[PDB]
Enzyme design. Structure first.
Site, PDB file in Angstrom:
ATOM      1  N   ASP A   1       0.889  -1.213   0.119  1.00  0.00           N
ATOM      2  CA  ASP A   1       0.147  -0.024  -0.045  1.00  0.00           C
ATOM      3  C   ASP A   1       0.915   1.229   0.054  1.00  0.00           C
ATOM      4  OD1 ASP A   1      -1.975   1.761   0.184  1.00  0.00           O
ATOM      5  OD2 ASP A   1      -2.701   1.164   2.213  1.00  0.00           O
TER       6      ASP A   1
ATOM      7  N   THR B   1      -2.579   7.272  -5.287  1.00  0.00           N
ATOM      8  CA  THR B   1      -1.779   8.084  -4.413  1.00  0.00           C
ATOM      9  C   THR B   1      -0.298   7.904  -4.901  1.00  0.00           C
ATOM     10  OG1 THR B   1      -3.117   7.563  -2.550  1.00  0.00           O
ATOM     11  CG2 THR B   1      -0.742   8.317  -1.897  1.00  0.00           C
ATOM     12  N   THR B   2      -0.021   6.834  -5.434  1.00  0.00           N
ATOM     13  CA  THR B   2       1.530   6.510  -6.034  1.00  0.00           C
ATOM     14  C   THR B   2       1.506   7.331  -7.413  1.00  0.00           C
ATOM     15  OG1 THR B   2       0.677   4.430  -6.781  1.00  0.00           O
ATOM     16  CG2 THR B   2       1.674   4.431  -4.518  1.00  0.00           C
TER      17      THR B   2
ATOM     18  N   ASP C   1     -14.099   4.733  -0.490  1.00  0.00           N
ATOM     19  CA  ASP C   1     -13.404   4.632  -1.723  1.00  0.00           C
ATOM     20  C   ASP C   1     -14.343   4.515  -2.846  1.00  0.00           C
ATOM     21  OD1 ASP C   1     -10.909   5.024  -0.519  1.00  0.00           O
ATOM     22  OD2 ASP C   1     -10.456   2.735  -0.679  1.00  0.00           O
TER      23      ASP C   1
END
Lengths: 543, 534, 91, 518
Positions: free
Chosen positions: D48, D81-82, D386
């Site tokens: 994650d 997010t990445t 989400d």
């Protein structure tokens, strides 16, 4: 710069089997094995042990040494706990289990260097152990009939005294067998009720004299003095004895009963009060017919003075363990309270006197052919207290050796002094040739591992090792016209003290080890030897 | 790319260290695998010695600095919570699967194809798992087959001499607590108690319950063929008045009167107990009465109970008193005033085994005890720990056979066949991918680690014993029939695992292939090893 | 990582037997000049700081307090010589 | 101590590159695992993106700015997010040789990043495709992107119903040239706040329109539902009041107790009589309620609810219309119970509830979550957030963008085509922006295992001729069209990713000096 492989764990130290820990473990055990090689046998050596408390002692027995040594290394701890396994269930074989299991690992190294797998090494000993335990049942010569005769006890106890205290063997044999025969009752064909407790034989020792002045009496012997003004009772049999748990003094109340002082008028009444009550209590107790009062607690000043006017022998026994064995002899029972010596609670004893042993006077407790005693005492005398204490250790192991004679086939015997050892080697090689497969290499090394016991007795005796070994082989290897090899299996390892030559027959000196000790020692030592070979790695971590 | 107090292993050398660290743990734990393995010793530093061949029991007692082996230790922890056996086997499957993948990692193969090839082979392994498995009948007359299951469990943790001792003990333990007509079983009903001062070969099975504290009196009966059992909560010893009082006696005889008057309250309950024995089957032969009474009993009542030949127990554990309700069936009597013969239970032979230090009481031969006991004997502490580990692993292994009706043949029958299957299947199927062929072939070659390790600890040539099995499998496949083949560790040739009686549980092998694949894949999925605070 | 001792010194072999003899010779060498009525006197300073001068082997050897275990055996026979006889504890 | 000159520019590049380099392999469903050894001896194997960097402590301040950027980015979009960290870190990495080796002034680059941001956002709008937000079947296939590879995949149809019914109540759809366009503003935080109820089934999860209160009714036997409820909200508690003087009550004599108790019963009755004057069926007090006030309102035929938060009463006022009143004597006639369906005392799982729900939507709903255990409730909670985050991105704009590196590569091609007419010194840092756009599809290929040079060259050449909708497949790794396998992310993910990346790139280039100390 130089890396390190094999250790991923917390910077510890762990020996992999590829590094040969098993060979290293045997080498560490070999250091302890050489300690016992100079122990076993009448020619063995004594080791001085300096305790951490500032006490210097010396003893032959290795089991006492292992208790005084701090054992940490895991390969050594296996045999130490195996020695304690030999210490339980029998009183002999401490040097047997250590030397035997140590040599089983010594001959195992020759198989490891050959490349033989350790599992195939353990499998070889397990098959050879079952062949040995089955053969020892047929290698029995005589069997103790359990007649409990003094001469029959001299046959068993004499070799037990050997290898511990030498030169006292024949002298201590008459002393130990006499006390054992006193505890052994007269019965036959009854195996349901066990008997012959080890605590039933007490051993006391006083400095002075020698072993020739030592005697055997039937009863307990107390070192404490005759506190009362009566030194000894009369020669009349069956004197009554009362065992008191409560101390000798004015009685109290079961509820509260705390003594308090307010004015001096009460203090004068407390002195006269304890004077009249104790005089009334000791009177009625002595009026019940009891001439001896054994107090497990303290004795008052006035309580002791009144019993002296009535001719009552006062002997204090603070130890409760001695009072329990005193009940098995006189028949009295301890009373928690004081003032009620019920005649059913009273016992009987023929003679209570005070004898001078070694210059000091002690009050004994004994009997002659009446009110039978289940407890006996050995009185030892000697000039050196050190060696005299080692005599007590040899007697206690001799008493435990008689405990080795019981219902589980203890009376079976085998010739000792390396006589059975050399014979068993040739019988195992007979099993080796008959058993096909790779077991032949492990079975033969299993028989060679038994050569350490006869070589030990010849090495400690100053004899030439190269000369005695073929004399043992040529004596047990003969050509007979038949399958059974006849007259003489009795050739042992001869401990001489004399000049000329050769080995001797076991029948001459009647020095042998029982089958119960030898069969149990081999089973434990082999299991302990195969256990050490089972560990190829050790790992230590934070608890 | 660094800050203060940081260490990072970034490139492919990071994965090489994690595999090498896992290869180091493999070489350690591969020695104890199988019945031909070795027995490791552990020392906690305080002088405690523990001998066990179980994987988890070793891993939990050791502290590992290597982060890769910690995940293996955590993975082996989940294996015992599910399977209960085969934790070492999972370690041998994970390590070799990484070594076989390491060869392809040096070739430049991305680990995703390597991990995806293991998941595809795992799905095909489950398909072969359902076809290769054997369905065992639920019948409880299968004890002959249970003797084979017991050997499969016992021979690993013992010298094989204790196998003949523990085989009738473990097998009788499971079926006695196993409920009739295909119900479940409770392993908690079998109690495991250790004792000292006897040889391990003297270990015996206890059908009933055993108690520690025995009756102390020389005249207590040694054995009673049949007896009525009383469960009593009432103290039979000397008591005191419920209200504060005192005993003032003028003479010694008056003190005995006040002492007997206070015990008279207990003596009144004592007379009701001894008269109840004569009330029901007093003169009848093969009948007796036993006092298991919880609270203390003075020696005065012990002398009275000895004249009646009644065994009197005192100072019993509260938990053992509740176990006697199930074992014996007698209800707990809180008050003697309400005592009735309907409250007492019935039991069989009760005989007190007398050892100098320890006295034993046997409640055995009960109508519906529904609780067993396994009394483990040994001289030392490590002898008790090794046998207890074999019993705990032996009871659960047999329990999984009755719970899970599916069985699999042992001796590497599942490993060797699946390794040969997946190699020949992927060539005929070709439905995965061309690059996946490396991951599928690496998994099939990694399944050979177990049959090669079993013969490695046995000392036999692994290449020779494997060729003999492959020749037998090819001859059995050309003959068009079903023949299960396995490696015989004693002789060294092949064997039929169904005839030799080497069997592995279905749940053990089901979670081993799935468990070892998921853990070994997660190790290959590691891109970078980060270290903070070191 | 394991040790066989925990700081317990134990030495054996034929060299240890000879080493036990040399310890007795050192004790003997001290008591040699005190043999005989004309023999020399030993000057002993006890840990109590009291200084005594005597030629009697009994009083002398009791003040040495030899720590060596094998040399302690010579102290046992000195008390036996002082008990059964009382004179000649030096010889 | 102090870092000045070009040395601070090097440290700013090294810090942002080190933070990104960790999570560069954390992008995609095939993303590789990361092993983080904790200083306490533990380790974390999870891949994650946010869970890793959160447990990693950094020193350089620019490394902390990259961590705070992801925290703000997570409030906008729930996933990706990445994606933002790689893009924000690669732009500074691509501008590194120009900033130092080419000696380009940072303001020149920052001024060029503002033009590259405007051109990049226009290309995203060109490659994006419209989507119908009113189609229920289309919205479920969208939210499903944040659903799959989770435990909620089996209930996904119900997971969308919880997300859709929640955003439809809060959404305000309006537009014109008069009062302006709200641009479909939806607040998931405050109004959509979930309530997790233990027990039941996931299928039993409902979207309740109203407010929910866990506090029970002060009396065990009360009306279970009210036909026409009259709600009264007030602040001051109902209890015997105190004077303005020093007066204290100490009663010793036995006959003086009833004198004060009669005054206590009278004063509380007057406070309850003021409430009952309008004959309410419901009484809700912000503070506590005395036992005497409970009895007077018990016989008055009204339910009493003690201890309700002030923030709750404001939401109670919207589902009802009750006017907030401070003093009990100040109760307004504007206080009404209208537009309230029922008052429910219903107990679920040995827990009493309160339902003020009505038949209308007062812009705020209440989500009632059920499950098999608390771990399932926490799983549904974060998965619904989400699910609502992706639903929020679709409701805040009706456009979808192709994923799997399709949009990332399509922009890089259009930036290079526009860069031809951009001549002048600002062209050099501008072309570094397009080279940073290719890093996102590069990490997907590196995580896939295919040849990065061969595929990216064929992928970029595919956009130059074929359609811009041809991306990279996540499971396979071969060039494929996004028409066949959709992987359609909302544009809001691409919007905020490009906007915050340029702002973060301009943030690090705007700091040329580093000074420590207070």
């Amino acid at each position: 710069q130089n890396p390190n492989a094999g250790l991923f764990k917390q910077g510890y130290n762990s020996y992999s089997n590829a590094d040969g820990q098993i060979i290293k473990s045997i080498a560490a055990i070999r250091e302890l094995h050489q300690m016992c090689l100079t122990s076993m046998g009448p020619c063995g050596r004594n080791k001085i042990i300096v305790n951490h408390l500032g006490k210097i002692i010396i003893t032959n027995d290795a089991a006492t040494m292992l208790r005084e040594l701090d054992i940490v290394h895991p390969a050594v701890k296996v045999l130490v706990m195996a020695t304690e396994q030999q210490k339980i269930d029998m009183g002999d074989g401490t040097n047997l289990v250590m030397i035997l299991a140590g040599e089983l690992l010594n001959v195992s190294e020759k198989l490891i260097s050959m490349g033989l797998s350790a599992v195939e090494i353990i499998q070889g000993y397990n098959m050879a152990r079952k062949f040995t335990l089955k053969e020892l049942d047929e290698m029995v010569v005589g069997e103790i009939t359990d007649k409990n005769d003094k001469n029959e006890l001299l046959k068993m106890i004499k070799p037990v005294i050997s290898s511990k205290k030498y030169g006292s063997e024949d002298i201590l044999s008459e002393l130990v067998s006499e006390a054992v025969s006193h505890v052994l009752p007269v019965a036959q064909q009854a195996g349901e009720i066990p008997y012959f407790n080890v605590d039933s034989i007490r051993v006391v020792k006083i400095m002075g004299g020698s072993l020739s002045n030592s005697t055997v009496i039937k009863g307990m012997v107390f070192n404490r003095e005759p506190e009362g003004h009566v030194k000894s009772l009369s020669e009349d049999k069956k004197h009554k004895v009362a065992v008191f748990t409560c101390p000798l003094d004015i009685a109290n109340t079961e509820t509260k009963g705390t003594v308090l002082l307010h004015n001096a008028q009460e203090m004068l009444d407390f002195s006269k009060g304890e004077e009249k009550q104790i005089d009334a209590m000791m009177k009625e107790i002595a009026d019940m017919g009891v001439e001896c009062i054994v107090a497990g607690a303290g004795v008052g000043e006035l309580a002791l003075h009144y019993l002296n006017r009535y001719g009552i022998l006062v002997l204090k026994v603070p130890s409760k363990f001695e009072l329990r064995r005193l009940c098995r002899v006189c028949g009295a029972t301890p009373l928690p309270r004081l003032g009620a010596p019920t005649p059913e609670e009273l016992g009987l004893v023929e003679t209570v006197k005070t004898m001078e042993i070694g210059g000091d006077r002690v009050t004994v407790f004994k009997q002659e052919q009446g009110e039978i005693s289940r407890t006996s005492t050995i009185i030892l005398r000697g000039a050196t207290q050190n060696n005299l204490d080692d005599i007590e250790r040899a007697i206690d192991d001799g008493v435990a050796a008689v405990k080795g004679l019981m219902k589980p086939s203890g009376g079976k015997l085998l010739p000792g002094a390396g006589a059975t050892e050399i014979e068993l080697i040739s019988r195992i090689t007979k099993y080796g040739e008959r058993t096909p497969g790779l077991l032949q290499l492990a079975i033969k090394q299993f028989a060679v591992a038994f050569e350490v016991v006869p070589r030990t007795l010849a090495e400690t005796a100053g004899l030439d090792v190269n000369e005695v070994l073929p004399n043992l082989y040529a004596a047990h290897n003969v050509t007979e016209p038949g399958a059974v090899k006849t007259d003489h299996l009795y050739k042992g390892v001869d401990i001489d003290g004399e000049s000329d030559e050769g080995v001797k027959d076991i029948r001459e000196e009647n020095i042998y080890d029982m089958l119960a000790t030898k069969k149990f020692a081999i089973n434990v030592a082999t299991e302990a030897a195969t256990t050490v070979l089972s560990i190829d790695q050790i790992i230590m971590a934070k608890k | 790319l660094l800050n203060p107090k940081a260490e990072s292993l970034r490139r492919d050398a990071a994965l090489k260290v994690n595999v090498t660290s896992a290869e180091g743990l493999q070489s350690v734990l591969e020695t104890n695998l199988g019945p031909k393995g070795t027995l490791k010793m552990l020392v906690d530093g305080a002088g405690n010695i523990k001998l066990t061949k179980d994987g988890k029991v070793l891993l939990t007692e050791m502290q590992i600095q290597s982060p890769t082996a910690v995940l293996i230790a955590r993975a082996a922890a989940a294996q015992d919570e599910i399977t209960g056996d085969g934790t070492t086997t999972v370690v041998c499957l994970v390590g070799e699967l990484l070594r076989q993948a390491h060869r392809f990692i040096q070739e430049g193969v991305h680990p995703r194809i390597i991990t995806d090839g293991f998941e595809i082979a795992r799905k095909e392994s489950m398909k072969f798992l359902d076809e290769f498995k054997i369905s065992k009948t639920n019948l409880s007359n299968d004890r002959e087959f249970l003797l084979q299951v017991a050997r499969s469990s016992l021979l690993t943790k013992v010298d094989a001499d204790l196998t003949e001792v523990l085989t009738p003990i473990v097998t009788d333990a499971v079926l006695s607590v196993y409920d009739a007509q295909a119900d479940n079983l409770d392993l908690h009903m079998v109690e495991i108690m250790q004792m000292q001062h006897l040889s391990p070969k003297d270990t015996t099975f206890i059908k009933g319950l055993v108690l520690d504290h025995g009756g102390r009196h020389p005249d207590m009966p040694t054995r009673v063929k049949n007896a009525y059992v009383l469960i009593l909560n009432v103290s039979l010893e000397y008591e005191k008045t419920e209200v504060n009082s005192g005993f003032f006696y003028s003479s010694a005889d008056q003190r005995d009167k006040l002492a007997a008057s206070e015990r008279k309250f207990v003596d009144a309950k004592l007379k009701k107990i001894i008269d109840l024995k004569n009330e029901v089957c007093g003169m009848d032969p093969d009948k007796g009465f036993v006092i298991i009474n919880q609270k203390g009993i003075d020696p005065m009542s012990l002398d009275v109970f000895a004249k009646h030949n009644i065994l009197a127990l005192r100072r019993a554990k509260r938990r053992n008193m509740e176990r006697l309700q199930l074992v014996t069936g007698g209800e707990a009597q809180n008050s003697v005033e309400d005592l009735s013969p309907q409250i007492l239970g019935f039991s069989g032979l009760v005989y007190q085994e007398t050892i100098g230090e320890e006295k034993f009481t046997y409640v055995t031969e009960n109508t519906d005890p529904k609780s067993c006991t396994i009394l483990i004997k040994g001289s030392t502490h490590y002898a008790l720990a090794q046998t207890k580990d074999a019993v705990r692993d032996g009871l659960r292994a047999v329990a999984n056979v009755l719970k899970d009706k599916n069985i699999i043949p042992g001796a590497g029958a599942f490993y060797i066949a699946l390794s040969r299957y997946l190699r020949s299947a992927n060539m005929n199927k070709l439905g995965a991918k061309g690059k996946t062929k490396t991951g599928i072939e690496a998994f099939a070659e990694a399944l050979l680690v177990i049959p090669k390790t079993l013969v490695k600890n046995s000392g036999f040539d692994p290449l020779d014993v494997l060729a003999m099995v492959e020749d037998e499998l090819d001859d059995a496949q050309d003959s068009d029939e079903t023949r299960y083949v396995g490696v015989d560790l004693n002789i060294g040739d092949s064997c039929d695992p169904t005839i030799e009686g080497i069997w592995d549980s279905y749940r053990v092998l089901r979670n081993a292939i799935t468990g070892a694949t998921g853990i070994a894949s997660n190790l290959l999925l590691c891109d970078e090893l980060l270290r903070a605070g070191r | 990582i394991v040790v066989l001792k925990e700081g317990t010194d134990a030495s054996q072999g034929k060299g240890q037997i000879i080493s036990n003899i040399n310890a007795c010779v050192a004790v003997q060498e001290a008591l040699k000049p005190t043999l005989g009525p004309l023999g020399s006197d030993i000057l002993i300073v006890t840990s109590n700081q009291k200084t005594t001068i005597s030629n009697d082997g009994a009083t002398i050897l009791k003040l040495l307090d030899v720590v060596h275990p094998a040399a302690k055996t010579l102290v046992d026979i000195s008390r036996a010589q002082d008990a059964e006889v009382g004179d000649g504890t030096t010889s | 101590e102090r870092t000045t000159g070009r040395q601070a520019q090097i440290s700013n590049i090294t810090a942002a590159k080190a933070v990104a380099d960790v999570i560069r392999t954390c992008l995609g469903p095939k993303a590789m695992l990361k092993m983080l050894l904790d200083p306490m001896g533990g380790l974390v194997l999870t891949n994650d993106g946010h869970a890793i960097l959160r447990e990693i402590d950094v020193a350089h301040p620019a490394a902390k700015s990259m961590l705070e950027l992801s925290r703000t980015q997570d409030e906008e979009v729930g996933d990706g997010t990445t994606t933002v960290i790689i893009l924000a870190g690669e732009i500074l990495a691509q501008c590194a040789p120009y900033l130092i080796e080419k000696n380009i002034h940072p303001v020149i680059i920052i001024q060029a990043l503002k033009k590259a941001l405007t051109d990049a956002l226009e290309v995203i709008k060109q490659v994006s495709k419209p989507v119908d937000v009113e189609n229920d079947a289309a919205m479920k296939k969208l939210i499903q992107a944040s659903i799959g590879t989770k435990y909620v995949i089996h209930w996904s149809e119900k997971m969308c119903e919880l997300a859709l019914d929640a955003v439809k109540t809060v959404r305000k759809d309006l537009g014109q040239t008069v009062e302006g366009e709200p641009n479909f503003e939806i607040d998931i935080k405050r109004y959509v706040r979930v309530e997790k109820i233990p027990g039941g089934d996931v299928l039993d999860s409902r979207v309740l329109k109203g407010v929910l209160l866990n506090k029970d009714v002060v009396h065990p036997k009360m009306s279970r539902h009210i036909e026409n409820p009259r709600v009264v909200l007030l602040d001051c508690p109902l209890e015997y009041k105190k004077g303005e003087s020093q007066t204290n009550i100490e009663i010793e004599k036995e006959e003086d107790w009833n004198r004060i108790l009669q005054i206590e019963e009278e004063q509380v009755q007057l406070m309850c009589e003021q409430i009952l004057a309008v004959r309410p069926t419901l009484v809700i007090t912000e503070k506590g309620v005395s036992d005497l006030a409970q009895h007077y309102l018990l016989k008055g035929g009204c339910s009493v609810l003690r201890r309700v938060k002030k923030s709750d009463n404001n939401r109670i006022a919207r589902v009802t219309g009750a006017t907030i009143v401070n003093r009990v004597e100040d109760l307004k006639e504007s206080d009404v119970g209208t537009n309230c369906g029922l008052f429910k005392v219903e107990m679920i799982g040995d827990e009493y509830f309160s339902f003020l729900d009505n038949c209308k939507e007062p812009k705020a709903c209440t989500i009632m979550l059920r499950g098999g255990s608390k771990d399932i409730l926490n799983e549904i909670d974060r998965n619904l957030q989400d699910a609502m985050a992706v639903a929020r991105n679709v409701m805040l704009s009706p456009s979808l963008s192709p994923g799997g590196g399709a949009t990332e590569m399509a922009v890089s091609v259009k930036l290079a085509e526009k860069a031809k007419q951009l001549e002048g010194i600002q062209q050099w840092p501008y072309q570094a922006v397009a080279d940073a756009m290719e890093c996102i599809p590069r990490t997907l290929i590196q995580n896939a295992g295919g040849d990065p040079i061969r595929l990216l060259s064929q992928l970029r050449a595919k956009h130059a001729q074929g359609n811009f909708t041809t991306g990279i497949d996540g499971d396979k790794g071969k060039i494929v069209d996004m028409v066949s396998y959709g992987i359609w992310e909302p544009e809001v993910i691409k919007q905020q990713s490009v906007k915050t990346a340029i702002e973060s790139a301009c943030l690090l280039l705007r700091v040329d000096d580093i000074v420590s100390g207070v």
